[model samples]
Target: EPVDPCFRANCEYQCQPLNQTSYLCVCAEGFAPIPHEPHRCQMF
Candidate 1:
């Protein structure tokens, strides 16, 4: 069995698992995602 990707993701904000295959890092409200570095965020 594969482990949850979110468990190892070093996200600055939120980390969500997708289709039990991969994970995504998203920025919450009041912040904007930077270019190239999708996981990185800046206060907007």
Candidate 2:
């Protein structure tokens, strides 16, 4: 799973694993949820 360029966080949309081959990126520390868009992990 690739990280988002805007927030540089793990996108929940892309985080959902549909199969065993799927993977998710973990957001870095000090990051908060973005309004409306939970997919973006904003860093404070």
Candidate 3:
């Protein structure tokens, strides 16, 4: 089964399908990428 990308900590995850086997996880607005944590999005 395909697993949806999970967002950990104070972050929001959006999944966009690029192909059948892959997807992109984008951060929600009013958030920025966190250093050392690629999947984390932080608010300013």
Candidate 4:
């Protein structure tokens, strides 16, 4: 079975950290986070 990943909410963006793969997804430094897949990171 597949396991769910952990997510953290940050002021700049949403942070998704994958411990199993040692990978992560960030909404960029100056951008906000979106709930859609393939969301773009835009400058503030």
Best by TM-score: 1
- For candidate 3, what is the TM-score? 0.37
Residue 30 lDDT, candidate 4, scale 0-100: 65
Indicate the TM-score of model 4.
0.27
Tens-digit per-residue lDDT, 1-44, candidate 4: 12322233222333456423324555556664443532235555
Q: Which residue pairs does candidate 1 place in steric collision?
A: none
Over the stretch 1-44, how does candidate 1's per-residue lDDT look in tens digits? 14542446556566765413434766567887665555557877
lDDT of 4 at 1: 10
lDDT of 3 by residue, 1-44 (tens): 13445433322466444323333455556767465443446775
Evaluation by lDDT, superior candidate among 3 and 4: 3
Candidate 2, position 4, lDDT:
52
Which residue pairs clash in candidate 2?
none
Instruction: In angstroms, give how far residue 33 of model 4 lies from its true place.
Output: 0.5
Rank candidates by TM-score, best first: 1, 3, 2, 4
- lDDT by residue (1-44, candidate 2, tens digit) is 34453333334434443223323433345675455444446677
| Model 1 stretches astray by more than 4 angstroms | 1-7, 18-23
Of 2 and 4, the candidate ahead on TM-score is 2
Worst 10 residues of 3 by lDDT: 1-10
Model 1: weakest 10-residue lDDT segment is: 1-10
